[PDB]
């Protein structure tokens, strides 16, 4: 439409692309997971696959506008390729992550960007104990590939992994599923480091 | 082709890209399937693979023209990447969907776009009972990835999955194949949500 087509144009084709966070201007990023299923286990290789949705939230001053100057538009969706996006990455993966959906975000007049692609991840996990009462735990830290806590502030809004889409006929049952954020201070180093630790305790149904 | 090239030149190359639908300017997208075969059933992982043609239809003012100004040309074929196409996707895929054909659309002088590519889709399904005489039911729902019922109005013309092309020597027998639209009203949320639920009930032939 008229104004949206104008809005997007002013936000994207006018200014240079956000160059990323810095210690003088730390960016807060909120992360959460919606676990759909544990689609694979492999005891011959100690590999585990998940299928879940991954949301990430951040706010950028450069993506701000006056709605009144743009036909009262409060927000819009756009290709995630049109914006800057974080490097929140799994740290102990065994394969290249697969995207199971489009990558489209939502920018809000105040600057909020939200983004939730579907993913399949293969990570390191010895699953011996899966076929049993007590089950087995699998942990996989998530954090930024290259920013310390001084530049990107990784936060979760709840320590609890969303299991409301966890498959009814999945071969496994979630004994527990947490997304706890830890902030590490290393005696070696002045800057802090943040990871969000995905811990999933589960067994064969 | 001088007439045709000039037309395409005027539509695509001269007017900003359709920025997608809004609450202010909604869009009806019609979706339907043609199931060819159920190609993989995996009891150990719980995934099913289907090959089918996926049909998508919508109309845009941005894409209408007067045949008289373009030598009576009423409709043309151009590749889907030349146009805006919706984000209708399977909310439960376990692998990136695989395109099995060229993606080319037919644009009409009235703004009607149609697009029917073939696809291999792996999704979540517990197939216990496929050997049985009663079969097994697998379900996957399709919907916009980023749009609500207020921006994308998703429908079907028939609740029947078209089985006129089903592979005659399939290892499987289709007991029923439906593509039913569902409108969701959540207690939490003002805006409605629409999925087109693809349900196939089948057994070994």
């Amino acid at each position: 439409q008229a104004n949206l087509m104008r809005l997007k144009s002013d936000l994207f084709n006018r200014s240079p692309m956000y160059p990323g966070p810095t210690k003088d201007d730390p960016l807060t990023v909120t992360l959460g997971f919606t676990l759909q299923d544990i689609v694979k286990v492999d005891s011959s290789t100690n590999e585990v696959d998940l299928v879940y949705y991954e949301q990430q939230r951040w706010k950028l001053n450069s993506l701000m506008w006056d709605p009144n100057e743009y036909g009262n538009i409060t927000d819009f969706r756009t290709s995630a390729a049109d914006i800057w996006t974080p490097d929140i990455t799994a740290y102990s993966s065994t394969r290249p992550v697969q995207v199971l959906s489009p990558q489209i975000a939502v920018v809000t007049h105040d600057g909020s960007v939200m983004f939730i692609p579907a993913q399949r991840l293969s990570f390191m996990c010895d699953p011996t104990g899966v076929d049993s009462e007590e089950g087995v735990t699998c942990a996989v830290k998530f954090g930024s590939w290259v920013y310390s806590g001084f530049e990107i502030d990784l936060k979760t809004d709840t320590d609890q992994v969303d299991l409301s889409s966890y498959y009814a006929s999945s071969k496994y049952e979630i004994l527990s599923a947490t997304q706890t954020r830890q902030v590490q201070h290393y005696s070696c180093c002045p800057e802090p480091y943040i990871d969000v630790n995905l811990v999933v305790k589960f067994r064969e149904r | 082709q001088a007439n045709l090239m000039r037309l395409k030149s005027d539509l695509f190359n001269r007017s900003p890209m359709y920025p997608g639908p809004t609450k202010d300017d909604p869009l009806t997208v019609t979706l339907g399937f043609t199931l060819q075969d159920i190609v993989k059933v995996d009891s150990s992982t719980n995934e099913v693979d289907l090959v089918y043609y996926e049909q998508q239809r919508w109309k845009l003012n941005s894409l209408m023209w007067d045949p008289n100004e373009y030598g009576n040309i009423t409709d043309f074929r151009t590749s889907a990447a030349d146009i805006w196409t919706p984000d209708i996707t399977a909310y439960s895929s376990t692998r990136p969907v695989q395109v099995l054909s060229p993606q080319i659309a037919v644009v009409t002088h009235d703004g009607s776009v149609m697009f029917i590519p073939a696809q291999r889709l792996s999704f979540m399904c517990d197939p216990t009972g496929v050997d049985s005489e009663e079969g097994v039911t697998c379900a996957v729902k399709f919907g916009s990835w980023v749009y609500s019922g207020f921006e994308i109005d998703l429908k079907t013309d028939t609740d029947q999955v078209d089985l006129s092309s089903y592979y005659a020597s399939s290892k499987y027998e289709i007991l029923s194949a439906t593509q039913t639209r569902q409108v969701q009203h959540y207690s939490c949320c003002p805006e409605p949500y629409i999925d087109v639920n693809l349900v196939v009930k089948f057994r070994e032939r």
Partner: peptide, 16 residues
């Protein structure tokens, strides 16, 4: 549920 679908999660981040 709302939180079981992508477009609803985009519209209701905290509300999920």
């Amino acid at each position: 549920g709302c939180c079981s679908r992508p477009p609803c999660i985009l519209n209701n981040p905290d509300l999920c």
